[PDB]
Write a protein that binds this ligand. Structure first.
Ligand SMILES: CC(C)(COP(=O)(O)OP(=O)(O)OC[C@H]1O[C@@H](n2cnc3c(N)ncnc32)[C@H](O)[C@@H]1OP(=O)(O)O)[C@@H](O)C(=O)NCCC(=O)NCCSCC(=O)c1ccc(O)cc1
Ligand SMILES: CC(C)(COP(=O)(O)OP(=O)(O)OC[C@H]1O[C@@H](n2cnc3c(N)ncnc32)[C@H](O)[C@@H]1OP(=O)(O)O)[C@@H](O)C(=O)NCCC(=O)NCCSCC(=O)c1ccc(O)cc1
Ligand SMILES: CC(C)(COP(=O)(O)OP(=O)(O)OC[C@H]1O[C@@H](n2cnc3c(N)ncnc32)[C@H](O)[C@@H]1OP(=O)(O)O)[C@@H](O)C(=O)NCCC(=O)NCCSCC(=O)c1ccc(O)cc1
Ligand SMILES: CC(C)(COP(=O)(O)OP(=O)(O)OC[C@H]1O[C@@H](n2cnc3c(N)ncnc32)[C@H](O)[C@@H]1OP(=O)(O)O)[C@@H](O)C(=O)NCCC(=O)NCCSCC(=O)c1ccc(O)cc1
Lengths: 140, 140, 140, 140
């Protein structure tokens, strides 16, 4: 459903049932250095005051940054998982879409780093979220 | 509902339709200095690898921190919204619950700061999330 | 001096006595959207392991970001001060120089945000540092 | 001079010559779970506006958190180095001292995490700085 990178033959939880499937995250482009995704704003994305939830921008950043790393390292026997996230909220989003662009800024052996920009339909930069992703040898 | 602070006669989005109500966040205690909330793990809270989504710890921290601020400042004519968030992920959660405790560490005239601990059912510290909350005069 | 923006007739501390002058920070370019600064590595910039001190990347980012804000807002009756900083360390620097480039990404009425890149003499990205800058009316 | 943990027979740079020796950082208590340090404010610690430099609070946090980790892991064949820092500035310090308390919150196999509180002489919490420290096998 969401176009997450297909790196495994099966997954513990299907897209539609995940947080990401529930709120409607969809990945558009995906390369080792850059990934983009979007989501249509609906109440399920908002908090009680009618604005997109701060948690939604973080979740979209965490998924996109982590999965962009997974797309490269999994076939090398590595697992990749977000280790830290820092989000700044510059302006709220009331409706329309949120579009995320993840740009790889450092790729170390144990940690990758991505800057994610989150824009509204007018192209205004509404939030930024940077992700540090830990890369470790798969256990299983 | 989620027991969010009842400060206004009408809210733009009903609890059950918000992201918060969708994933099942509920506030337990709330005072000016400290607040606690919890959620049952379901697939809606998970990513496709079967663990609680990074976004979920951040979303919980953000609502809890911001709303504990609203609880104080709203009746004073002020609006409060998360301005930034920094989250670090120490151990995953596969199932059970996530419990948040938010401790106010600074209450400035324009900015309030909260540290939020996220623990599993064994009590282990799985993530921490710092929230900075902007406090501004309410627009009419 | 360090070529900091000349916005006032008197400053409480002379360049050469500040932390900035002590370690040798110097601003090269400064515009409303972008500013650059550099420092020669000396032992004064190092920790006891012989590498550039973590604090030094943060100090450089903080002065550069805040002062690029002062450069705009001071003549408008506003004071600007760093409010938060997030720094990630990708590679150490043993010797040579550290070059900073600060790019303004949001300019709000109360908060400005800058991303600062810190590079070695080979051009490699050694650290990044995000600064949030508070902008408030100047106290008389 | 600064009471840094004595874990090696020699060091690349002597205390007095380091950033830390220059500005005057001194460690008081040091255990695996908690460390404290202070520094006397003098112009060398301040920026041109007469307030303690934002970089000074970060440097004191980075040193104290990293060195508290070094104190445990070095004798186990590990190196420890700060990997990220996030600092919030709640109130400025004009003079007197800055006192730092570092509290260990997580100790993983590859990353430790410390929260550092930075107080003035009245005991007010002026800044907080959290440090993530990478722990890796020594190379040499
Ligand atoms: C944070 C801040 C208020 C700081 O203001 P600033 O940096 O000085 O920016 P500025 O004041 O230039 O205004 C930018 C925009 O912010 C909004 N804004 C600014 N000030 C105000 C205000 N006093 N009242 C209402 N909106 C404001 C407004 O949209 C403004 O655009 P415009 O109408 O002025 O063109 C502004 O950047 C902002 O509103 N950012 C977005 C906040 C946000 O989206 N937060 C997400 C976390 S919210 C917490 C959360 O997740 C949550 C979840 C559940 C729950 O129940 C409660 C909270
Ligand atoms: C990041 C890191 C691996 C660093 O490991 P560490 O500091 O070395 O901790 P240590 O290695 O001491 O092990 C502690 C626990 O981490 C886990 N862990 C560590 N290494 C591994 C590994 N190679 N494989 C699996 N689990 C591991 C494991 O649970 C371990 O406990 P135990 O099984 O050993 O008792 C660890 O702290 C951790 O796993 N943190 C949790 C990461 C997390 O929960 N991320 C949340 C954002 S995740 C990304 C995200 O949101 C997302 C959403 C959608 C999507 O499609 C993809 C991702
Ligand atoms: C944190 C980390 C080790 C993570 O490693 P990574 O993401 O796996 O990067 P990778 O492992 O891909 O290696 C990249 C570079 O890191 C360095 N590095 C990585 N592993 C090691 C290691 N085991 N031993 C020494 N250097 C290493 C090395 O320079 C390497 O390049 P190369 O020599 O391999 O060409 C690496 O990104 C790094 O070294 N970052 C710089 C850390 C830094 O500069 N810290 C600044 C705050 S440091 C703490 C501080 O301020 C302080 C002040 C006073 C005091 O008394 C003590 C500390
Ligand atoms: C950031 C902010 C202004 C936000 O205000 P707030 O969160 O609403 O807190 P609140 O307004 O309740 O006031 C707390 C204290 O802040 C100070 N403050 C607050 N507003 C103002 C103002 N408009 N004018 C002057 N001082 C103020 C004042 O000390 C106040 O105490 P009191 O006199 O009100 O008792 C306040 O928390 C603050 O001043 N924090 C400290 C800022 C700081 O120390 N920054 C360090 C980085 S500064 C950037 C830097 O490193 C640098 C280095 C070199 C260089 O050349 C330039 C910069």
């Amino acid at each position: 459903g969401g176009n997450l990178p297909d790196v495994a033959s099966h997954y513990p939880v299907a897209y539609e049932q995940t947080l990401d499937g529930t709120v409607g995250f969809v990945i558009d482009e995906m390369t080792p250095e850059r990934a983009t995704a979007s989501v249509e704003v609906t109440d399920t994305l908002r908090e009680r005051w009618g604005l997109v939830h701060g948690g939604a921008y973080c979740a979209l950043a965490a998924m996109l940054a982590t999965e962009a790393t997974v797309a490269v390292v999994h076939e090398k026997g590595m697992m990749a998982v977000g280790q830290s996230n820092h989000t700044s909220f510059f302006r709220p989003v009331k409706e329309g879409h949120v579009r995320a662009e993840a740009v790889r800024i450092h790729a170390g052996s144990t940690t990758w780093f991505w800057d994610v920009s989150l824009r509204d339909d007018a192209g205004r930069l509404c939030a930024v979220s940077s992700m540090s992703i830990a890369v470790r040898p798969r256990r299983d």
